[PDB]
Every structure is written in structure tokens, then in C-alpha cells.
Amino acid sequence: SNRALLLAALAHGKTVLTNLLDSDDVRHMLNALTALGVSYTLSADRTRCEIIGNGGPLHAEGALELFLGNAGTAMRPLAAALCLGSNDIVLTGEPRMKERPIGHLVDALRLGGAKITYLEQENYPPLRLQGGFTGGNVDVDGSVSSQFLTALLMTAPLAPEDTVIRIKGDLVSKPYIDITLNLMKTFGVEIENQHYQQFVVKGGQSYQSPGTYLVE
């Protein structure tokens, strides 16, 4: 899941994610959507999830606190997606989450005009999101996590202004990025990759529900 669910909520319409992953990582990907007020349903095998698209950034009533401990792949995309409109969210996790710094994403997003503040430790799991991402050249280290660039890849197109993520060195897992842009494309957005780094995304985009999607 991770993305499929996030883009599903950031989209307009009900989209199904088939073959999802049964793990707190996904449950929260759902729970996060759940907290912001994203409507969706889960099958019986806990692998099929349909979500009534929110039509864009999931607005949190009052401030939120999402615990994406085992959702190391969900926090990245969330920390980014939630910095779209204007929502006060706290993205935390389990002790193991502390082994997954998020500063690289925060700056990358915060650089695009996103509102992100460090809670516990700097560049660590906790994050205070307050939306605001508009666009602009973003810097994301190549060796970090495919969910970092992916986070910006999904969030940036929904940004009023176009964004460029320049990758310092060699992407951590381009193959992951390939899926994201492909799976993201099904949602209605396209990003332009450069020399195995730099990314060019058009801002002011919108996410639509492709209907049913199979997460491999």
C-alpha cells in the first residue's frame, strides 16, 4: 500500500487497492486517511481497500497525530502529502521508527513552501505538519529512501507551483520511483525524471480515482 492508499485519498472518487499489505504500515496508511477523515472500506482479506477520494489534501479537523511506526513507507508519503493544504499533523512512530530519520523529506518539502517542524529530535519520526507546500526547487539526497522522493513526487504535483527535486548522487531505489510515477499516473499525475536524479513535476495537478488498482 503506502502510496496507493495515500493517492487514493488525495484523489477524487472511490478507488480500490487490491493485494494491499496486511501490516500496521498499511493499517495506518488507512488510519492516517482515517484520522484526516478519508472515507474508505477494507475487504475481508485485509488486502483490498477502497477509498472515497477526498479530492486533494486530506484536511485534519483540529490537529492530528499519526503514528506510522511500522509504516516507514507511509510516513514519508504522509509527511509530504499532508503538507499540501493546511493541516496540523504530528507524524510519529515506534522506537524502531527512530531508526528512520525524516529530516531529508521535511527539508525537501519545507523547501517547497511546506510547513514542517521537528518534534522530538531533528530529522526524526515526529513531525508537525501544517500544510503550505506550493512548489519550488527541492533538494533530496539520492541515498535516503525511495519513499522520500516519492513523497514529493505525489505531493509536488498537487502543489500550486511546479517543483524540481534534485537528487544528490544516485537514487536509493529508482525502481520504487518508477512504480510511484506509474501508480501515481493512474491517479492523474505525471513527473519528469532527469539524469537519474533531478525530477520535474508540474504543480496544480489533481488526483482522480482510476477505479481499481492492484498493488504488486
Hey, is 112 helix, strand or coil? coil
Q: Is the separation of the CB atoms in 9 and 53 below 8 Å? A: yes
Residue 147 known to bind ligand: yes
Output the nine-digit C-alpha cell for 69: 511506526
**DSSP, res 86:** -
Hey, is 191 helix, strand or coil? strand
Residue 113 known to bind ligand: no
Hey, is 198 helix, strand or coil? coil
Residue 146 known to bind ligand: yes
Pairing between β-strand 64-67 and β-strand 191-193 as defined by DSSP bridges: unpaired
Output the nine-digit C-alpha cell for 162: 511546479
Residue 39 known to bind ligand: no
Residue 85 known to bind ligand: no
C-alpha span between 118 and 124 (Å, rounded): 7
Residue 72 known to bind ligand: yes
Q: Which residues contact 44 (CB under 8 A, 6 or more apart)?
A: none
Within 10 Å of residue 56's Cβ, how many Cβ atoms? 17
Residue 173 known to bind ligand: yes
> What residues form the annotated binding site for phosphoenolpyruvate?
72, 100, 147
> What residues form the annotated binding site for 3-phosphoshikimate?
3, 145-147, 173
> What residues form the annotated binding site?
3, 72, 100, 145-147, 173
